[PDB]
Amino acid sequence: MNTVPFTSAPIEVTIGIDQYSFNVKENQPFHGIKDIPIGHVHVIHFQHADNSSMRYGYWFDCRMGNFYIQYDPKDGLYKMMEERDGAKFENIVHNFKERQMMVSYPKIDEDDTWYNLTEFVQMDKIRKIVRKDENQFSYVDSSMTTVQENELSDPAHSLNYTVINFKSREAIRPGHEMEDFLDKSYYLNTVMLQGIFKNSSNYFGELQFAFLNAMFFGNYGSSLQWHAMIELICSSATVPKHMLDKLDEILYYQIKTLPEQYSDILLNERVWNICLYSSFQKNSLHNTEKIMENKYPELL
Amino acid sequence: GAMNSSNYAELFNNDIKLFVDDTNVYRVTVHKTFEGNVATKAINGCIFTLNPKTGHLFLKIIHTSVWAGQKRLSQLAKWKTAEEVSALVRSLPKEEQPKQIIVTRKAMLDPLEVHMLDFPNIAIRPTELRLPFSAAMSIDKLSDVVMKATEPQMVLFNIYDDWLDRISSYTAFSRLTLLLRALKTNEESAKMILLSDPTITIKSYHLWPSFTDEQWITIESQMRDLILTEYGRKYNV
Ligand SMILES: CNS(=O)(=O)c1ccc(OC)c(Br)c1
């Protein structure tokens, strides 16, 4: 297990680690988070008490370096840092763990929730969506716009998701206008999967990352990207059987983890109703349709 | 966005535009089968594409052969319409292509958008206007060319005949809409109005009779009376 030690917590903040979260009072003797499962990506996220504007956070993989968090009184946020001096990380980490100043990543042994939400998410790909190569972790916040959003302002701070646009020449073959608009299998299989993503794992990883950025940061463009990638599959007549089975699993856990009270803003009624009840795959997402109907029937 | 009463006069400015009406693309006669079931028989159709400024009507004749062995014909018809409009645009020189194309039905928006992706600078628009272009097939000479076609075929008409020599396009369009509205509300009566006087004839190169200015005022009033009359017959007013 791994550790993200904190220099201090000078300002009151709700701290997020993956799907858990806890409140740290201003100048509380909080020195970071211990027992973080090696082997998954993770996300440590913040919402300041005094201003819930800007949720913000860092995606990281403990295998890629030793990371710590220090508040920056000038820029006014908790910043992720990498300490290249391994020995110093051990001493820094060992004092705080003996003085018990750290919260334990609180994973239940029956619980595969995080593995299931991040199954196909890789840091290497995260870092191509979030351009900032001088760091091994990736910063994200609520307000970052996506490349397609910028097409419809600062390019350095965008989310470079894969543009999906159903009324685009990329999506529509000359001579197959109707066929390709009504059945997006061409765009899904030849254009996106074979052409751009190479495999369905890479596709699902971006989708899963988009959902997580939407849920954890309220990042609106991520939510758009999430719904588009779902809708692209659901609107394809011809999808590999294994992809539909995994998609159902991916979505089931996303819907299961979603705060009941955030459903009105993170869930597009048209997309979901279309996907579960009107699309080619209306009958193929059994787990997802069951949880969606028993949890958010109002939406349907 | 959408064309309505606030911006009605944009039709007559000098940006090239076309109305596309797809109502008569896919036309059927429903009849009983020997087994007592019901079956359709398609008949020839037509795309009604019109420059409201010039009166140039590009009448694309949809022969029933284009439906053979096809499913979901009402849906195909929208995409067939879009295919043919995109072909017409592509056939025109660039200086003649429309800057906007206004569809009389919202269901044509996406078909036409998708077929015009090569033309991003052409605006595809709906309209809130209720235009009577479905009555285009009540114009004998148009109806004749459609029903006689043995193959796909485009015929070019001026739906204003020589009216623009004497009136403006705003006025020509208003006459046309009123003519077609009347033919749509009561075709027989409308045709009786138009052809009751044998001494006013339709020139071989025209669609409508050679009414003088004064006689068009009469006709236009009789057409309004007809539309008023039927309104009362309908609603019992
Ligand atoms: C700049 N390196 S360092 O020694 O100050 C350092 C400070 C704080 C740390 O965690 C709180 C770690 Br780990 C390293």
Side-chain angles (χ1 to χ4, degrees), chain A residues 1-151 154-300, chain B:
Chain A
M1 316 299 277
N2 275 127
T3 298
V4 186
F6 275 54
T7 282
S8 58
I11 86 168
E12 216 169 273
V13 63
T14 307
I15 303 184
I17 175 71
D18 301 352
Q19 78 269 29
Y20 314 101
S21 69
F22 53 92
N23 306 314
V24 176
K25 299 301 174 295
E26 175 198 324
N27 291 319
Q28 173 180 326
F30 171 83
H31 297 298
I33 306 171
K34 66 178 188 161
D35 307 325
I36 300 168
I38 320 142
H40 306 120
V41 308
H42 296 286
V43 66
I44 185 165
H45 29 128
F46 304 94
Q47 197 155 28
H48 297 180
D50 60 343
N51 166 58
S52 39
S53 303
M54 190 183 48
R55 284 185 260 181
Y56 68 93
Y58 308 83
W59 288 96
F60 66 94
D61 185 313
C62 266
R63 296 167 283 191
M64 290 169 72
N66 293 333
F67 316 95
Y68 75 90
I69 301 278
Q70 188 156 332
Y71 188 65
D72 169 0
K74 172 155 148 138
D75 291 350
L77 67 190
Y78 291 98
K79 293 200 167 149
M80 178 152 276
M81 318 298 199
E82 185 151 31
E83 158 85 287
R84 69 165 248 121
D85 192 348
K88 251 169 140 212
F89 185 73
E90 261 213 63
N91 180 182
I92 282 295
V93 162
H94 179 255
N95 162 64
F96 293 155
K97 256 207 238 191
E98 280 281 277
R99 302 225 283 163
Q100 295 195 41
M101 298 281 91
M102 308 190 156
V103 288
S104 170
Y105 190 103
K107 191 189 161 305
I108 295 316
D109 310 295
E110 186 192 15
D111 171 63
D112 268 344
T113 288
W114 191 240
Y115 170 82
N116 286 312
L117 295 161
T118 63
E119 165 169 11
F120 303 95
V121 187
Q122 329 170 257
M123 264 317 304
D124 69 281
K125 300 303 199 321
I126 284 181
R127 296 178 79 256
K128 303 180 188 305
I129 294 160
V130 192
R131 303 217 168 278
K132 194 160 199 296
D133 297 296
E134 73 286 347
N135 298 317
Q136 299 273 297
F137 44 85
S138 301
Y139 172 85
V140 181
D141 63 44
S142 345
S143 77
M144 286 164 62
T145 58
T146 67
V147 167
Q148 160 177 85
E149 279 186 306
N150 298 142
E151 292 165 359
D154 185 13
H157 209 55
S158 286
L159 287 163
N160 307 277
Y161 289 118
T162 289
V163 170
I164 298 167
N165 178 357
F166 293 136
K167 289 195 282 187
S168 60
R169 177 49 65 206
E170 292 66 45
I172 305 286
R173 278 174 297 175
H176 298 260
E177 276 87 5
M178 176 186 202
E179 167 180 29
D180 283 356
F181 185 62
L182 295 171
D183 170 10
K184 320 221 163 258
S185 301
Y186 161 72
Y187 194 36
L188 171 61
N189 290 297
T190 299
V191 180
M192 284 294 166
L193 290 174
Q194 169 174 295
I196 302 178
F197 283 101
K198 309 317 173 173
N199 53 65
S200 61
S201 294
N202 282 336
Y203 184 100
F204 285 143
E206 181 167 334
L207 195 151
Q208 290 179 311
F209 182 60
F211 169 78
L212 288 170
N213 287 326
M215 175 172 62
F216 283 129
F217 304 116
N219 179 273
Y220 173 69
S222 299
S223 184
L224 294 186
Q225 183 65 16
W226 180 55
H227 285 95
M229 300 189 74
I230 304 181
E231 193 184 351
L232 174 53
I233 294 181
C234 290
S235 302
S236 291
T238 306
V239 188
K241 312 86 171 49
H242 76 267
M243 266 193 77
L244 298 171
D245 289 336
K246 182 62 66 165
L247 187 65
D248 192 30
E249 283 299 338
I250 283 162
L251 294 183
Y252 169 84
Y253 287 97
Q254 283 166 347
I255 303 305
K256 185 175 176 62
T257 307
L258 253 191
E260 306 71 42
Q261 304 270 312
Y262 287 19
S263 34
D264 48 305
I265 62 183
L266 290 170
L267 285 179
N268 186 292
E269 192 205 59
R270 172 195 77 85
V271 168
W272 282 97
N273 282 255
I274 272 54
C275 285
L276 297 173
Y277 306 111
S278 329
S279 76
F280 286 116
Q281 307 312 333
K282 63 192 172 308
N283 301 320
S284 311
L285 296 168
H286 306 111
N287 299 351
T288 290
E289 177 168 315
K290 190 170 293 315
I291 195 175
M292 277 286 293
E293 285 184 0
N294 275 286
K295 187 164 184 202
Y296 303 121
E298 328 91 30
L299 194 79
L300 320 158
Chain B
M3 215 258 305
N4 61 37
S5 257
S6 292
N7 54 21
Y8 183 65
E10 180 182 17
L11 298 184
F12 314 105
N13 65 35
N14 293 92
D15 273 23
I16 305 175
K17 47 183 69 68
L18 302 164
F19 276 106
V20 170
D21 185 77
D22 73 317
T23 291
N24 294 294
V25 171
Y26 172 47
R27 318 197 288 150
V28 295
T29 46
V30 173
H31 60 81
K32 277 283 192 59
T33 82
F34 181 76
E35 294 68 16
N37 297 132
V38 170
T40 58
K41 191 189 160 304
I43 57 183
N44 287 350
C46 65
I47 303 161
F48 181 90
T49 301
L50 174 68
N51 191 326
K53 187 76 176 186
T54 65
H56 276 213
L57 171 60
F58 305 83
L59 193 87
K60 175 60 188 207
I61 309 190
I62 299 311
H63 180 269
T64 67
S65 63
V66 309
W67 312 127
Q70 307 292 327
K71 274 108 181 68
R72 294 186 50 85
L73 297 189
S74 63
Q75 190 170 262
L76 176 58
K78 302 173 191 321
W79 293 87
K80 183 38 171 204
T81 296
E83 184 173 50
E84 299 295 339
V85 165
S86 78
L88 167 63
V89 172
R90 287 162 211 278
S91 77
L92 291 167
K94 190 180 186 228
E95 87 258 352
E96 297 177 41
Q97 299 167 338
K99 295 107 182 195
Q100 325 165 14
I101 300 172
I102 308 163
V103 287
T104 54
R105 311 203 290 174
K106 311 190 197 64
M108 288 293 313
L109 293 164
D110 277 338
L112 192 53
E113 172 161 10
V114 165
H115 276 274
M116 305 291 295
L117 294 173
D118 306 323
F119 295 100
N121 293 323
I122 299 181
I124 300 305
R125 298 172 77 208
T127 164
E128 301 296 344
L129 296 172
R130 51 273 206 151
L131 299 135
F133 291 151
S134 73
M137 285 294 97
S138 303
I139 300 174
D140 293 321
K141 282 188 195 195
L142 298 183
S143 182
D144 288 342
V145 66
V146 172
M147 289 316 286
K148 295 194 213 297
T150 53
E151 49 190 316
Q153 181 180 350
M154 155 104 96
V155 180
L156 281 223
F157 291 99
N158 198 309
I159 211 168
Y160 297 158
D161 290 344
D162 65 340
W163 296 345
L164 295 181
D165 294 350
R166 306 198 59 85
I167 62 184
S168 69
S169 60
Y170 185 103
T171 303
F173 190 77
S174 290
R175 180 181 298 165
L176 171 71
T177 61
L178 171 62
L179 292 179
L180 292 183
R181 189 51 79 183
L183 290 157
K184 186 177 189 174
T185 319
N186 186 321
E187 181 178 14
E188 188 212 294
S189 309
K191 297 182 152 192
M192 281 297 287
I193 287 167
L194 293 163
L195 322 167
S196 59
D197 184 335
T199 81
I200 321 167
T201 68
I202 297 170
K203 296 309 174 284
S204 60
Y205 46 91
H206 283 168
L207 301 180
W208 318 93
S210 322
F211 289 127
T212 72
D213 286 11
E214 300 310 306
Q215 292 171 335
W216 268 123
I217 298 295
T218 301
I219 295 294
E220 293 163 332
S221 198
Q222 295 182 336
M223 286 303 191
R224 291 186 295 268
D225 283 339
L226 177 159
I227 296 154
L228 203 69
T229 292
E230 286 303 315
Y231 179 93
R233 292 174 82 253
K234 209 217 217 211
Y235 296 100
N236 296 323
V237 165

